Amino acid sequence: TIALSEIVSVVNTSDGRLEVFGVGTDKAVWHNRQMAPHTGSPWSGWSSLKGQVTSKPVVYINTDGRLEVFARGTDNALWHIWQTATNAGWSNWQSLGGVITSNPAIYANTDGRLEVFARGADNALWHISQTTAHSGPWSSWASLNGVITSNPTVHINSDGRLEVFARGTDNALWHIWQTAPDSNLWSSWESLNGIITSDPVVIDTADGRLEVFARGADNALWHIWQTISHSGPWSGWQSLNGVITSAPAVAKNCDNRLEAFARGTDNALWHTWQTVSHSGPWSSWQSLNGVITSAPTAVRDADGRLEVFARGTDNALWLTWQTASSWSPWISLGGVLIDASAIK
Amino acid sequence: SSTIALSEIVSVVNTSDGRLEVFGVGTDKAVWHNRQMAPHTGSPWSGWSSLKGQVTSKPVVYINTDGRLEVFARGTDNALWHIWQTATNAGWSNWQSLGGVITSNPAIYANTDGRLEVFARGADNALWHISQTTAHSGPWSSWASLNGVITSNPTVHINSDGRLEVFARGTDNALWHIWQTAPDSNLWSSWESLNGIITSDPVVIDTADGRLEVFARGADNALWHIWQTISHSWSGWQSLNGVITSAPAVAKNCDNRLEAFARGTDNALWHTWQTVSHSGPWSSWQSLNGVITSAPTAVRDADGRLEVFARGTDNALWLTWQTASSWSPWISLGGVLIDASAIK
Ligand SMILES: C[C@@H]1O[C@@H](C[C@@H]2C[C@H](O)O[C@H](CO)[C@H]2O)[C@@H](O)[C@H](O)[C@@H]1O
Ligand SMILES: C[C@@H]1O[C@@H](C[C@@H]2C[C@H](O)O[C@H](CO)[C@H]2O)[C@@H](O)[C@H](O)[C@@H]1O
Ligand SMILES: C[C@@H]1O[C@@H](C[C@@H]2C[C@H](O)O[C@H](CO)[C@H]2O)[C@@H](O)[C@H](O)[C@@H]1O
Ligand SMILES: C[C@@H]1O[C@@H](C[C@@H]2C[C@H](O)O[C@H](CO)[C@H]2O)[C@@H](O)[C@H](O)[C@@H]1O
Ligand SMILES: C[C@@H]1O[C@@H](C[C@@H]2C[C@H](O)O[C@H](CO)[C@H]2O)[C@@H](O)[C@H](O)[C@@H]1O
Ligand SMILES: [Cl-]
Ligand code: NA
Ligand code: NA
């Protein structure tokens, strides 16, 4: 078990449009993009990329701008589909083999090779990668060992080393990392302790330190960080308080101030934000209303505003965004979305 | 034309850990640098320290995809020389020669595969270039030519689809450009003219909506600009007025609104900015005071605030930044800087 997941994967595209990906009642991947690179732009509407997926689909922007969606398939292998060019159509769904047991986690190495991390049948962390930048063919799968109990999350350090996080068998946050950029040489697994009851959410701060967010045993929102840019030692666990009934989402305001979002005990969107600057103390929790049935997903848009997405009581994706003063009334992008996360 | 508007005095970069760090040439012809202590507006500065060398161009810093800074400059023997941090944000190597014979300041960008590629004018007046053979690493490739005959320092930027594109003034004084036909490629297009008459180095940026847009001073000494019509497509040349006595400097506010800077006829800092949003109209020119003896250098710091550097009447480097309402008063970072620009 883990706190209620995010219903969609979202990306700010190379032309500054938000674009959201989720699973339909039919088990296919569907997407929705902004027309215009602005807060409040009209949306395309939901359209199908087809496939039949058995995990959350996860979008990533290749270093040449082209989106690529990863999702577990009906055969439990990793499959993908990618734009043929930045403002063009899509490929056919294609298989990368393997047998996996979590949602895929994706990051681009410093050399532009996308690297995919996913849980195995053995419950280890496995990985596979592009052989050259933003392009097939891909490597063979190999394992990074471990025994993990959540979906993994990956983020690049400010020195180019990929680093992967997942819950362990003791329910602590565990991590593993590249010892050199673009490398196949990884550390051992190391515990960062704690007790976590959601997927980790990982952020690179403005000052170059990995910060992990997670729900605790008390259902508060807790966070732990690197104390030095791309380096240990780590901090201790620190509570941001709150009582949250979903997974948290975290993103950066345009001034780099972190801002955490989560479903509350009342099923509204609540948030807490850094005050003053990117190294300032956190607000108290405040409500952004609505009644939501997934964790929120947050993203900064091409106007430097945070937009937050969440499923509604009618199973459609709803949207609220920052304004000069406040936030905008909930609006509906329509659709009917399922939670297809491969671990719940 | 054998002249261009007064060049920038330093080259600025956002460090891997989010600090501003400027590089210039002292009276001994060595490359010197200064950085902020902490990544906030109005942080104290380290003071100037020497990386030695003897340079006959402006030194141009670029950040590798692993976070290590690397400084490029023409040497006393007209070869391209370089010096790099041997570990992200830590110590520096010795200067080494990349050979070649060049006649401009060097222009640098990362390919989508992490390989830096350096462009500069040759002895034969054509555009030459060289690159790292693997991501953020030597050895370097052979020098090669993209032909052309150019009369300004070249400017390189990457398209929103990963193709590098280089801009330089031609022998008819028009803006000319030439581009990669694929990312990471040695395949380029032919040279093409964007017409106009330019009296400065071109300055190039990527808009939030993924368009290359080039600013340059014109024949009437106004700031002009031109752009790609669609992401990685040009428009006509449009004037932004002013009478400017230096090269311009463009940077993005945290909401992505462009803002241009340049020295006035009264030798003060002037600015004009996009209003409302990043597709908004351009304000009229306003003074930021000060008396400057170079073109300004503009950059967004980790507080989402714009900071502008310019040499002063005393030859020190001076600084003013955006506040909540206005701009801070000009302050001196000291040092004694010269214009070592290979083309003036
Ligand atoms: C994600 C994948 O979706 C499907 C791939 C299908 C493969 C076929 O060439 O095109 C279809 C749509 O026209 C795809 O949907 C499944 O068959 C596969 O097993 C897996 O679940
Ligand atoms: C993620 C972690 O994986 C395992 C760590 C193991 C720790 C040991 O030093 O090396 C093994 C393989 O070389 C790891 O698999 C679990 O024992 C641990 O409790 C936790 O779940
Ligand atoms: C996210 C929020 O966290 C909770 C706790 C918050 C706990 C903190 O110590 O004080 C705040 C102000 O009194 C509370 O709002 C709930 O009150 C609320 O229903 C929601 O779940
Ligand atoms: C940029 C370079 O700077 C100098 C490099 C020097 C190379 C020497 O071995 O060590 C010195 C450090 O104290 C450097 O300054 C010039 O000799 C060279 O010709 C070139 O102009
Ligand atoms: C940048 C441009 O370089 C030259 C373009 C030339 C155009 C010609 O047809 O092909 C040559 C070989 O590649 C180019 O060198 C100049 O003649 C032009 O005036 C301008 O300065
Ligand atoms: Cl001088
Ligand atoms: Na969501
Ligand atoms: Na490239």
Numbering used by the authors:
A (entry chain B): 26 to 369
B (entry chain A): 24 to 256, 259 to 369
Could you give the paper's own sentences about this structure?
As mixing PHL with the branched compounds leads to protein precipitation and thus prevents co-crystallization, the direct study of complexes was not possible. Therefore, we soaked the PHL crystals with monomeric fucoside 2, 3 and 4, respectively. Crystal structures confirmed that all the studied fucosides were able to bind the lectin PHL. In each complex, the electron density was clear enough to determine the position of the fucosyl part of the compounds in 6 out of 7 fucose-binding sites of at least one PHL monomer unit – A or B, while site 2 is occupied by Met60 of the neighbouring monomer, as was observed previously. The second saccharide unit was clearly assigned for all three fucosides 2–4 in sites 1 and 3. Considering fucosides 2–4, the position of the bridging methylene group is close to the α-Me-Fuc O1 atom, which is not directly coordinated by the protein in the complex. The O4 of the d-arabino-hexopyranosyl unit in fucoside 2 and 4 is coordinated by a glycine backbone nitrogen in sites 1, 3, 5, and 6, while the O6 atom of fucoside 3 is linked to a tryptophan backbone oxygen in sites 4 and 6. When comparing the overall orientation of the second hexopyranosyl unit of fucosides 2–4, it is similar to the galactose unit of blood group H trisaccharide, with minor distortions in individual binding sites influenced e.g. by crystal packing. The remaining parts of fucosides 2 and 3 were not resolved in the electron density, suggesting their negligible importance for ligand binding. The second saccharide unit of studied fucosides was only marginally coordinated by PHL binding sites what, together with affinity comparable to monosaccharides, suggests a low importance of this type of compounds for inhibitor design.
As a part of our ongoing programme focused on host-pathogen interactions at the molecular level, we identified a lectin in the P. asymbiotica genome designated PHL, which we prepared in a fully functional recombinant form. The lectin PHL interacts selectively, mainly with l-fucose and oligosaccharides containing terminal l-fucose residue, and prefers an α-glycosidic bond over a β-linkage. The PHL lectin forms a seven-bladed β-propeller assembling into a homo-dimer. Both units contain two types of binding sites situated between the blades and have different amino acid compositions and binding preferences.
